[PDB]
Design an enzyme around this catalytic site. Structure first.
Site, PDB file in Angstrom:
ATOM      1  N   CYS B  92     -56.941  68.979 -79.286  1.00 48.51           N
ATOM      2  CA  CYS B  92     -55.847  68.101 -78.863  1.00 48.51           C
ATOM      3  C   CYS B  92     -54.470  68.510 -79.377  1.00 48.51           C
ATOM      4  O   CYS B  92     -53.454  68.198 -78.758  1.00 48.51           O
ATOM      5  CB  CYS B  92     -56.145  66.658 -79.292  1.00 48.51           C
ATOM      6  SG  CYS B  92     -57.638  65.958 -78.554  1.00 48.51           S
ATOM      7  N   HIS B 356     -52.796  62.815 -70.892  1.00 46.86           N
ATOM      8  CA  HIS B 356     -52.902  63.707 -72.043  1.00 46.86           C
ATOM      9  C   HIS B 356     -53.537  65.005 -71.602  1.00 46.86           C
ATOM     10  O   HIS B 356     -54.767  65.169 -71.680  1.00 46.86           O
ATOM     11  CB  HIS B 356     -53.647  62.961 -73.158  1.00 46.86           C
ATOM     12  CG  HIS B 356     -54.214  63.827 -74.265  1.00 46.86           C
ATOM     13  ND1 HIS B 356     -53.553  64.866 -74.798  1.00 46.86           N
ATOM     14  CD2 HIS B 356     -55.413  63.723 -74.969  1.00 46.86           C
ATOM     15  CE1 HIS B 356     -54.300  65.427 -75.769  1.00 46.86           C
ATOM     16  NE2 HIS B 356     -55.435  64.718 -75.878  1.00 46.86           N
ATOM     17  N   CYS B 386     -54.151  63.638 -83.436  1.00 46.78           N
ATOM     18  CA  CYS B 386     -55.515  63.772 -83.946  1.00 46.78           C
ATOM     19  C   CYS B 386     -56.227  64.902 -83.203  1.00 46.78           C
ATOM     20  O   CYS B 386     -55.768  65.362 -82.153  1.00 46.78           O
ATOM     21  CB  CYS B 386     -56.295  62.450 -83.807  1.00 46.78           C
ATOM     22  SG  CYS B 386     -56.226  61.641 -82.181  1.00 46.78           S
ATOM     23  N   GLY B 388     -60.333  66.950 -82.445  1.00 51.16           N
ATOM     24  CA  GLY B 388     -61.799  66.977 -82.486  1.00 51.16           C
ATOM     25  C   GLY B 388     -62.337  67.702 -83.710  1.00 51.16           C
ATOM     26  O   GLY B 388     -61.813  68.744 -84.109  1.00 51.16           O
TER      27      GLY B 388
END
Ligand SMILES: CC(C)(COP(=O)(O)OP(=O)(O)OC[C@H]1O[C@@H](n2cnc3c(N)ncnc32)[C@H](O)[C@@H]1OP(=O)(O)O)[C@@H](O)C(=O)NCCC(=O)NCCS
Ligand SMILES: CC(C)(COP(=O)(O)OP(=O)(O)OC[C@H]1O[C@@H](n2cnc3c(N)ncnc32)[C@H](O)[C@@H]1OP(=O)(O)O)[C@@H](O)C(=O)NCCC(=O)NCCS
Ligand SMILES: CC(C)(COP(=O)(O)OP(=O)(O)OC[C@H]1O[C@@H](n2cnc3c(N)ncnc32)[C@H](O)[C@@H]1OP(=O)(O)O)[C@@H](O)C(=O)NCCC(=O)NCCS
Ligand SMILES: Nc1ncnc2c1ncn2[C@@H]1O[C@H](COP(=O)(O)OP(=O)(O)O)[C@@H](O)[C@H]1O
Lengths: 729, 400, 402
Positions: B92, B356, B386, B388
């Site tokens: 991300c 996103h 944040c 993964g």
């Protein structure tokens, strides 16, 4: 590259070679050292020679039949050898299993058809030999089983079983249907799931059918004769390989689903099988096969396989062969069983006795009560008909074997009494009193009691020789243990008769000496007592339940505590306290006792009264009682999860050793299987006695490591964890 | 730590939606090339030979996004052959990581002028397309307790006690602020409309936006999970004290699956002056940290603390906080952990409203903050996402 | 501001493509393996101080998908704060990983960083990941796509490197890799691969053919006439290189880099970061540079990147004790050597990818580690490391022994 275990400068031959006039070779497996063919050193050397010969004489061979001269086909790997493999033996184990597979690979890529003629049970290594053949014919005979049960011994099918079934069925189906649980199939089921191709009615038809099949295959399919589907150019793995989008989408969920099923218990085998299955599917057959060997070697040289082999091979075998059955005694067939009490237990006992083919009189205090007891069997039969596991005709005959009654006089002709009334001595005296003169003079007088000493129950009858404890576990239709308890006056003959009854109903017996709480009840007591103590210490109930499940127990301890009544737990503690206080001693209460009493005072004494640690709504367990947290200041104590797991497991292991010391149990085999089957001690431990010698933790393996950890827990949580002398130097 | 790193331009495409989206017909490479040609148009006399690298975040670098898409962009746009091109993936955070790496390359002194950003055509190359060393491997998937991020978001909500209404209130607010930002003309300069080979308009606005969202509408939606695996049970095996996961996340309070790309020009002071470029903000500090891998979306909290500590700043010193809206609860938890004033947080809306596009989002939300600082005439923004596995990335920028 | 130091540089042996020892091994395990070796060397290292793990990987798909670097962090039980980023700059990925680590350390915002790469080419073949330059026609036409092998043959043709010339280079690489192995040069740095039971899988570079002769090399068939005539790539190349009448196809399986499996790891940090963890610096990263030349010839990128990195450091060819250029193809090394006038005895002195193989995303980090060791062994001062890349890129790095 060699088919042999050695390549430098003498074992028995187990394979009979016969070559037909047509060029068909029959290999008949017949180990002269036992009643079954096992994948031992003799087998390995024998098949190596045979396979060498198939290669040498290939110009004159058109086909091969693999057969057996035993009652069974082939019975699997040599456990006696596998149990001894140390970590440093990984190389040898890996080499052995690579050699086995090299032979089977040659068999399979011979350029000619090979047919397994499966006369009887083909299990583990046995089915693996068969899967290396191009066609499998099975005799549809009585008792014949097929499957790969090595996961049940904490192993995996390391002789090609994983690789081949994955190649045959794809990852998901091979894992879920065959590998993960290692279920044994009847020849009919085997055919349905595709483990077997054809069935014949009798054993004599096999070899001829096999030879006929070879003949037709050579004529009808000359180009593809002796070529497994995965060895063809256009092969497509059913369900796809891991790189195929459909499977890739669900694949990451497989390990999580498995961890869900196992509830986080430390059982390495299912995990290793899944990794072997998937990794194997990513590469060519031979590479897949070699990965399989590495995972096999990993389990074998580990501790859990050792624990599980000890329990589910050695201990079970010993038990099933009458290890706890007195020596001199013959048989006494059972004509008519009488059950006293129609609650869960009595209704359950009536079912299993009826299902085994026995006539049953089910007596309660009213006909209404006794009828609803038989209704328990009707419910089970309804489900069994819906799931299609029995016929209407068979079911109707089962149910018609049970006669519900309110009348004591209906126990006429009864030669086996199983009493399952309320846990009260004077009641059991009365109930046996009403019946002892009506039953056959030679009738067994058996009591399903969970705590009351048998010696004390026996006095309420005239023939105390025939009075015995016959202890079942809830639910009776599912729980496989019968704990048989010998009262002081119980005869050896009475033992055998109940022993034989247990086998007859498809259950496993342990023979235990009379003592308060016997084996099962006393030991399970320590387990739930530890949990309640943690709740009293201020541990989150959610954590306690997680620790129970991640330990490997079939049910979490607080949940279980509800099923065992808390009032029952109270009067057990009252009884122990009384014996000590009457003998001039001072009683040391378990910390759990105060937690039990607290819940009684709160009117939350268990499921039977609608409220316990859980909330119960409309016959269903809802969630944990939200009032628990305030009552016990939950969260104020946060010990490591492993400390909680260990407290539960160790309390039981220690209490098992006491039972052995006091002579309550007479063999560790009984201790292990009894703990596993009776009180749900985790299968991966091999049992509550095996747990001691096979302990593995952060600081070592074995009895010495167990003793250290127990002292560690003692220092942290209380002296009850100090090991008995019998464990020390 | 020698040369100061400056942001000279920060642009992005509009974000196209997953189902019947306007960008579905557009190759992710074209999305990037379009942005290069906007920069070319904005500075027609820039000597492109002075651009030493192009660094793009891409989370599924496969198919249309394979074979180092950054180098493809360099060559396809006819940029000098010496201008590099590297693809990177830090899930991300990829987009911001590319900017951060670009800035770090400038600070080291060995690069002068760098293009950073990211690209994700999620409608053409779905999340997960690239397979994954973890999932393709039961042995390590089993050992490392993998649970999808949605489950972590639901778990955060359960632990912190954010209700379904709490998370939906955040969602409604995201939509409102995105709408306000759009009507206000806040994005007119930075969203570069996507056009075809003939100059015809394909898309000029963030079409995932649902500006007429209501409390009532959001309450009608179904929870996303209850994936149909056993991940709840796995989560609770690590978090043994939690009884039951409350599933509050829906398509209405989770980030949108969308198509998009972003570019950021980063350079030293000399690099920019030499090419007649005006600096818009300075990269003050960057940080990479993380937290627990099962509650995997809780890594922005220690990453922010680390970037604040490193720049000698406190929460009070920051005018605008921009945290990717992967899931409502992640945002609420971040706001709670650090006592972030509501009116300083995601002030122009976020990914619940606009989507996103994994590898690009970092660069998009960075550019969003550059524009907003300029517009408010404010001084400092902190941008964070944040990741993964439980990672977090964070950057402080100061308006110049 | 901060200097970047190399504290450890290790690699796996390289498994071959056909019937290779490492085919059964997941690329993730290759990395975890090397992480465990670093733990073994420094058991008291505070792993919380490692802020990132940066891995080069050219085919980041399947087993290599999903940020393999993050996967390595988690699979090895490294702290969850320890990062993990995958990068892809084609052939240079491994060295790019190192350079980025060095740049991060220099910037002040990272203290201690693991860098390296991994490529399991036998499991994840080159091209498995797709890409627009090859698979989208509009931009394939636009970039004049041509396989790098054809560029290598074209270099040979333009420079007058004969088939004998490229084979002679190939023989030398073989001889030099065998001498390095027999000499124990690689004993500390090549970490044997083992299974879950501790059994040996591979402890050497399988691709090597130390009994290579010039006669045997001469027997081989040109490898890249299957792409050249039956793909039209020769004609595409010559449309640009219009003065060249015909491409001489001199490269074979014996004078091109081997397709192999392997991984490499490098520990990079500041003086303070190392001091805190009791680590002895082995070399300093002096300078880095990325550059390029024409994307049709594809593999002339090493030259301007080497010039830029020498200029950045204020050094000349004369200042450099050792030159290490990846042996993608013999002609590329010979072109490089001629251009910069590199003395023979300073070039790829321990053998290269023709002998040992070229595991794409790892190679850059492997040959870097090789130079760290060779400097320490010879007691020499500086090495320059460089690799060619797809689409005409180049990366170069100068390291200095400490
Ligand atoms: C095949 C079977 C159903 C029939 O059993 P049976 O003939 O009624 O009686 P037994 O099983 O006791 O067989 C007699 C002998 O064979 C031995 N035997 C059977 N399977 C064996 C195995 N897998 N390894 C070693 N020995 C085995 C028994 O130990 C016994 O030895 P003994 O005669 O020296 O005491 C039964 O032997 C069985 O269940 N085998 C185990 C298969 C299995 O669980 N598979 C996994 C193992 S890899
Ligand atoms: C987006 C995600 C929730 C999937 O949801 P989805 O159902 O495909 O998205 P949709 O827009 O179709 O939403 C489903 C429904 O909610 C409705 N909905 C969404 N937002 C709404 C709003 N504000 N008001 C009313 N309805 C709304 C949609 O209309 C749709 O209705 P329908 O079912 O009648 O068609 C999920 O995949 C996701 O966002 N994951 C996060 C990705 C991520 O963080 N990646 C990690 C990077 S490594
Ligand atoms: C190496 C490459 C030519 C593939 O070749 P290959 O034929 O698969 O590999 P081999 O080694 O089998 O080919 C050589 C043949 O001659 C033999 N041979 C190889 N090297 C030899 C040597 N030094 N001496 C004698 N014989 C040799 C081999 O046995 C083989 O012969 P065979 O057909 O009888 O088995 C080509 O794919 C390649 O080099 N790619 C490299 C990728 C690259 O450059 N990087 C990409 C970055 S974008
Ligand atoms: N092992 C545990 N057992 C019970 N409760 C816990 C545990 N760990 C955390 N908690 C809960 O979380 C709170 C503090 O820990 P937390 O801040 O969640 O730790 P983390 O850093 O892991 O998020 C406490 O209020 C407690 O209720």
């Amino acid at each position: 590259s060699s088919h042999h275990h050695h390549h430098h400068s003498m074992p028995d031959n187990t394979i009979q070679w016969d070559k037909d006039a047509d060029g068909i070779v029959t290999l008949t497996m017949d180990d002269p050292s036992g009643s079954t063919n096992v994948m031992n050193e003799a087998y390995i050397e024998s098949m190596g020679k045979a396979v060498d010969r198939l290669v040498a004489e290939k110009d004159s061979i058109t086909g091969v039949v693999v057969a057996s001269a035993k009652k069974t086909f082939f019975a699997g790997g040599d456990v006696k050898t596998m149990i001894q493999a140390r970590p440093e033996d990984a190389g040898d184990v890996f080499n052995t299993v690579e050699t086995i597979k090299r032979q089977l690979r040659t068999l399979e890529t011979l350029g000619k058809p090979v047919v397994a003629a499966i006369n009887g049970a083909a299990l583990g290594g046995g089915l693996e030999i068969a899967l290396a053949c191009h066609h499998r014919i099975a005799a549809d005979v009585k008792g014949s089983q097929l499957g790969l049960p090595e996961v049940t011994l904490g192993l995996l099918p390391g002789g090609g079983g994983v690789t081949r079934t994955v190649r045959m069925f794809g990852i998901q189906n091979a894992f879920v249907s065959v590998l993960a649980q290692g279920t044994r199939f009847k020849p009919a089921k085997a055919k349905e799931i595709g483990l077997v191709d054809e069935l014949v009615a009798t054993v004599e038809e096999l070899v001829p059918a096999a030879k006929a099949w070879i003949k037709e295959e050579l004529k009808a399919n000359p180009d593809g004769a002796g070529v497994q589907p995965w060895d063809k150019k256009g092969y497509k793995m059913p369900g796809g390989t891991p790189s195929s989008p459909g499977l890739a989408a669900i694949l990451p969920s497989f390990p999580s689903n498995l961890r869900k099923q196992l509830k986080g218990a430390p059982m390495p085998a299912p995990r290793a099988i899944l990794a072997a299955a998937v990794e194997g599917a990513q590469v060519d057959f031979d590479t897949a096969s070699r990965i399989e060997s590495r995972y096999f070697a990993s389990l074998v040289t580990g501790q859990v396989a050792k624990n599980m082999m000890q329990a589910f091979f050695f201990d079970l075998q010993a038990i099933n062969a009458g290890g706890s059955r007195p020596e001199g005694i013959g048989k006494t067939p059972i004509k008519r069983i009488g059950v006293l009490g129609a609650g869960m237990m009595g209704a359950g006992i009536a079912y299993v006795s009826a299902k085994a083919g026995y006539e049953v009189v089910l007596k309660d205090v009213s006909l209404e009560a006794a009828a609803k007891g038989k209704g328990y069997s009707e419910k089970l039969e309804a489900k069994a008909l819906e799931r299609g596991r029995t016929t209407q005709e068979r079911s109707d005959a089962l149910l018609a074997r049970i006669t519900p009654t309110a009348d004591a006089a209906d126990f006429k002709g009864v030669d086996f009494v199983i009493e399952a009334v309320f846990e009260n001595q004077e009641l059991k005296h009365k109930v046996f009193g009403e019946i002892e003169d009506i039953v056959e003079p030679n009738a067994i007088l058996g009591s399903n009691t969970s705590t009351l000493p048998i010696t004390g129950l026996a006095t309420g009858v005239k023939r105390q020789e025939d009075f015995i404890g016959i202890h079942f576990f809830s639910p009776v239709d599912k729980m496989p243990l019968v704990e048989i308890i010998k009262g002081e006056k119980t005869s050896d003959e009475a033992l055998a008769r109940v022993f034989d009854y247990t086998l007859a109903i498809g259950k496993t017996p342990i023979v235990v000496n009379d003592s308060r709480g016997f084996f099962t009840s006393r030991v399970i007591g320590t387990f739930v007592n530890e949990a309640l103590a943690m709740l009293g210490e201020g541990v989150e109930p959610a954590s306690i339940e997680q620790a129970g499940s991640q330990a490997g127990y079939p049910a979490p301890p607080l949940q279980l505590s509800d099923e065992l009544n808390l009032e029952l737990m109270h009067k057990i503690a009252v009884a122990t306290r009384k014996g000590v206080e009457d003998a001039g001693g001072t009683y040391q209460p378990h910390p759990a006792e105060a937690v039990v009493e607290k819940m009684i005072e709160l009117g939350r004494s268990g499921r039977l009264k609608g409220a316990g640690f859980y909330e119960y709504a409309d016959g269903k367990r809802s969630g944990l009682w939200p009032g628990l947290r305030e009552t016990f200041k939950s969260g104020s104590s946060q010990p490591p999860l492993q400390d909680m797991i260990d407290r539960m497991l160790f309390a039981e292991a220690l209490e098992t050793q006491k039972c052995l010391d006091e002579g309550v149990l007479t063999s560790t085999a009984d201790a292990n299987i009894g703990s596993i089957m009776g009180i749900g001690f985790p299968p991966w431990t091999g049992g509550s006695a095996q747990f001691i010698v096979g302990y593995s933790g952060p600081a070592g393996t074995g009895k010495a490591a167990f003793v250290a950890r127990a002292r560690e827990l003692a220092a942290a949580y209380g002296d009850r964890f100090l090991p008995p002398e019998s464990l020390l130097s | 730590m020698s040369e100061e790193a400056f942001i000279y331009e920060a642009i992005r495409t509009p974000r196209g939606k997953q189902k019947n989206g306007s960008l579905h017909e557009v190759k992710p490479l074209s999305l990037v090339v379009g942005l290069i040609d906007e920069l070319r148009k904005r500075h027609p006399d820039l000597d492109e030979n002075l651009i030493s690298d192009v660094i793009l975040g891409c989370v599924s670098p496969v198919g249309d996004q394979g074979g180092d898409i950054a180098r493809a962009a360099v060559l396809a746009s006819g940029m000098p052959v010496t201008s590099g091109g590297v693809q990177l993936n830090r899930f991300c955070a990829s987009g911001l990581e590319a900017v951060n790496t670009a800035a770090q390359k400038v600070r080291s002194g060995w690069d002068d002028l760098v293009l950073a950003g990211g690209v994700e055509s999620m409608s053409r190359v779905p999340m997960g397309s690239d397979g994954g060393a973890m999932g393709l491997d039961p042995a390590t998937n089993y050992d490392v307790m993998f649970v999808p991020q949605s489950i972590g978001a639901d778990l955060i909500a359960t632990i912190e006690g954010f209700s379904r209404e709490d998370v939906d209130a955040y969602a409604l607010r995201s939509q409102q602020k995105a709408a306000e930002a759009w009507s206000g003309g806040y994005f007119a300069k930075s969203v570069v409309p996507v056009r075809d080979q003939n100059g015809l308009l394909i898309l000029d606005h963030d079409e995932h936006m649902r500006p007429d969202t209501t409390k009532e509408g959001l309450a009608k939606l179904k929870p996303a999970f209850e994936a149909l695996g056993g991940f709840d049970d796995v989560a609770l095996q690590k978090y043994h004290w939690v009884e039951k996961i409350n599933h509050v996340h829906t398509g209405g309070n989770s980030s949108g699956i969308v198509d998009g790309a972003a570019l950021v020009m980063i350079g030293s002071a000399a690099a920019g002056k030499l090419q007649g470029l005006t600096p818009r903000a300075r990269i003050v500090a960057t940080a990479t940290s993380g937290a627990d891998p099962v509650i995997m979306l809780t890594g922005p909290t220690p990453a922010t603390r680390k970037v604040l500590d490193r720049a000698g700043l406190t929460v009070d010193d920051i005018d605008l906080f921009e945290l990717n809206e992967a899931f409502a609860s992640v945002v609420l938890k971040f706001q709670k952990d650090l006592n972030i004033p509501d009116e300083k947080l995601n002030v122009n809306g976020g990914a619940i409203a606009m989507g996103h596009p994994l590898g690009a989002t970092g660069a998009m939300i960075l550019g969003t903050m550059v524009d907003e600082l300029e517009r408010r005439n404010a001084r400092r923004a902190l941008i964070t996402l944040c990741i993964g596995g439980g990672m977090g990335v964070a950057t402080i920028i100061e308006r110049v």
